[PDB]
Amino acid sequence: VVGGXXGG
């Protein structure tokens, strides 16, 4: 959701 490097 918040971040990067894959998902979220």
Side-chain angles (χ1 to χ4, degrees):
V1 181
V2 177

